[PDB]
Amino acid sequence: GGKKKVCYYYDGDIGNYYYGQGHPMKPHRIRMTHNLLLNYGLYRKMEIYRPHKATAEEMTKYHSDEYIKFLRSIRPDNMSEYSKQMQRFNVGEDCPVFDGLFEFCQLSTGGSVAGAVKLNRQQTDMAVNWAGGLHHAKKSEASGFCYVNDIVLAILELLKYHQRVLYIDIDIHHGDGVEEAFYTTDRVMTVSFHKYGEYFPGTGDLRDIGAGKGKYYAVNFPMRDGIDDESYGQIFKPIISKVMEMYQPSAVVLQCGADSLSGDRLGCFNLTVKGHAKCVEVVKTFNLPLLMLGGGGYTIRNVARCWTYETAVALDCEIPNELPYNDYFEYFGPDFKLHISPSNMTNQNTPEYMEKIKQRLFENLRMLP
Ligand SMILES: Nc1ccc(-c2ccc(F)cc2)cc1NC(=O)[C@@H]1C[C@H]2CC[C@@H](C1)O2
Numbered sequence: 001g002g003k004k005k006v007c008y009y010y011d012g013d014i015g016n017y018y019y020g021q022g023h024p025m026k027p028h029r030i031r032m033t034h035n036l037l038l039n040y041g042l043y044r045k046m047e048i049y050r051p052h053k054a055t056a057e058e059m060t061k062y063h064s065d066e067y068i069k070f071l072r073s074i075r076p077d078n079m080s081e082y083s084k085q086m087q088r089f090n091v092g093e094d095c096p097v098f099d100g101l102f103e104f105c106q107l108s109t110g111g112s113v114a115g116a117v118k119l120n121r122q123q124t125d126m127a128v129n130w131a132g133g134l135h136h137a138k139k140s141e142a143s144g145f146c147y148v149n150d151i152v153l154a155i156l157e158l159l160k161y162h163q164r165v166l167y168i169d170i171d172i173h174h175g176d177g178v179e180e181a182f183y184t185t186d187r188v189m190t191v192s193f194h195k196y197g198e199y200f201p202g203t204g205d206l207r208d209i210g211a212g213k214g215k216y217y218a219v220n221f222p223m224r225d226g227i228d229d230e231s232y233g234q235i236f237k238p239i240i241s242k243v244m245e246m247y248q249p250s251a252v253v254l255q256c257g258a259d260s261l262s263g264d265r266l267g268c269f270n271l272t273v274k275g276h277a278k279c280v281e282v283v284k285t286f287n288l289p290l291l292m293l294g295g296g297g298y299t300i301r302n303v304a305r306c307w308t309y310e311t312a313v314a315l316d317c318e319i320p321n322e323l324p325y326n327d328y329f330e331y332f333g334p335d336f337k338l339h340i341s342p343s344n345m346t347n348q349n350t351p352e353y354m355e356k357i358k359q360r361l362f363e364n365l366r367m368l369p
């Protein structure tokens with residue numbers, strides 16, 4: 001048990017990257033998160049590092065040479081010359097070309113891989129990179145605002161020193177890029193909780209359980225609109241406890257996508273910051289090397305709240321509900337509190353549904369050796 005060493009990765013340039021007018025991804029939210037947690041005094045309890053810019057050598061440990069070469073070359077001024085490749089690599093529309101795109105990929109990736117190295121060297125208990133968690137990016141394809149899969153790269157780093165790595169994903173969307181990368185291996189177990197049914201990315205059915213050596217090492221909990229703290233807490237600790245018992249990982253990667261929070265611009269879940277952060281508390285009790293990553297989140301005031309509170313949880317530091325003054329204080333009106341209320345939206349996940357899906361996942365976890 002006990003309190004644990006936390007290393008936290010942040011680059012002050014991250015907030016200046018801009019996806020374009022009306023695009024819901026705001027890298028500014030990482031700066032808001034940073035500034036809020038600094039104003040709570042949480043810098044006093046952890047080591048703050050600036051990530052290196054991850055190289056093409058680092059990125060091509062997973063991604064194709066042609067895809068990384070394209071990301072290094074593509075700019076707003078030369079887009080007409082790469083019309084074929086833009087379509088091939090799924091760049092230009094939802095994943096736009098913007099100024100400094102490659103540098104943005106290098107920063108988000110750098111934090112996750114640096115955190116993994118720190119964990120491998122046994123120089124920290126927890127590593128935190130809120131700029132990471134880009135779980136949709138594929139080997140040779142951008143997807144869902146993600147270009148470079150920092151998570152896959154960080155897990156490959158952990159696999160140098162860890163026989164078994166557990167990946168847990170509480171983003172509202174299915175962690176499809178991470179699942180796909182490790183679908184045929186027992187050395188990574190991927191566990192995703194997500195909205196499923198007529199929803200992006202369209203994968204992560206209950207019946208998707210892995211293949212070959214990876215059969216029974218992919219776990220998917222499909223959910224409906226409006227899941228709440230009670231319903232999520234119903235199943236999270238039981239599932240993760242059973243996974244820990246059967247799989248026995250030596251390192252953990254937790255993707256903490258904040259688009260599962262109540263009031264998210266794109267999401268349809270109803271979790272509070274406390275309900276979301278209960279997942280961090282559950283994972284942290286197992287006392288394994290832990291990489292905590294960001295993810296989605298489009299109501300940026302709540303993203304800042306969520307990841308500030310989850311940093312406090314990682315540190316075992318109680319922080320007051322009254323928000324301290326900060327550079328983005330006006331974003332947190334009209335209440336200026338840390339914690340959020342759930343909406344009155346209907347929870348389409350019945351208690352019977354939650355128990356039934358849990359029981360079917362328990363059947364699959366019995367098939368581990
Ligand atoms: N899930 C996720 C996780 C991380 C990042 C992400 C991407 C780049 C970053 F620098 C940091 C985080 C994005 C998503 N993308 C979504 O949530 C969108 C997927 C599609 C398109 C609109 C809607 C929402 O459906």
Ligand SMILES: [Ca+2]
Pocket residue numbers: 169170171172173174175192193194
């Ligand atoms: Ca998920």
Ligand SMILES: [Ca+2]
Pocket residue numbers: 182183184185186187188189190210214217218
């Ligand atoms: Ca697997």
Ligand SMILES: [Zn+2]
Pocket residue numbers: 171172173257259295296297
């Ligand atoms: Zn998401």
